[PDB]
Amino acid sequence: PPGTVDKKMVEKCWKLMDKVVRLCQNPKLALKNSPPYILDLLPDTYQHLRTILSRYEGKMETLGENEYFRVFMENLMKKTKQTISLFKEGKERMYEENSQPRRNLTKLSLIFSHMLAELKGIFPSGLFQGDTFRITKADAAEFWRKAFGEKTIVPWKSFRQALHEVHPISSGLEAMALKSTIDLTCNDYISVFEFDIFTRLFQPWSSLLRNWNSLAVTHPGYMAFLTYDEVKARLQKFIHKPGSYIFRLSCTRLGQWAIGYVTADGNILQTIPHNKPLFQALIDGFREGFYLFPDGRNQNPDLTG
């Protein structure tokens, strides 16, 4: 594990978020004001940590001893530092849309949003609930508790091994694929929260990895760490090709899918499917004319089986 968190540890990141914020208030950035919005996420995080801190009144060093939280505070300083190092080591090219240091900022924005979700799900009301966490899918629940008990968080390697025993992982490159599908906070730890989001998105547990294989590894329409505005912008190029669609993880309704597609009246709509697995949304969308050409490609995966 990583070091003790004291009160002086937290003043550190508060100062670092401050520097991130002021850096993000640059007119030149022309920072769209929509989820994930770094300029809210950061204040909200601090806000939530005040909450956690104000509740660990006095016993402020039972908290200092929390593993998950010690990992979190670490990652947090880490991520905020990276971010600061982009504005430095990337100088001017922050400012062209579709440039490295600017997509990386979106990625970072994204991770930041995953962090706050993870935290809030582990500390609802600001008071630790990691080990009493309800996992959503019956069968995923079974696996986790029967492999990690009431642990909130494991290291990646640990998780990989455990998973492999039940759902073998074809290869090292695949493992690596999986690792960045599931490590939403990019911390080389898998948390119970992280695990639930993956297991919801890729049900039934029974065929978990086969599912993930068909919907993400081998699927032209899957998009990785992509935001809503990014989906609108990407599908611009197919505006004259209705049926063109992509899809991704919803950022605000974490654990759910967000399909984006071009209509015959020529707008670009986005839905969160409900009460169907993703498989069937996509099959029906094909069958019904709405989801025909993934990311523009004429060729569309057969999933009926």
Binding site: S250, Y261, T263, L269, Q270, T271, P273
Partner: peptide, 5 residues
């Protein structure tokens, strides 16, 4: 987000 097609 908007209703499924």
């Amino acid at each position: 987000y908007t209703p499924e097609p």
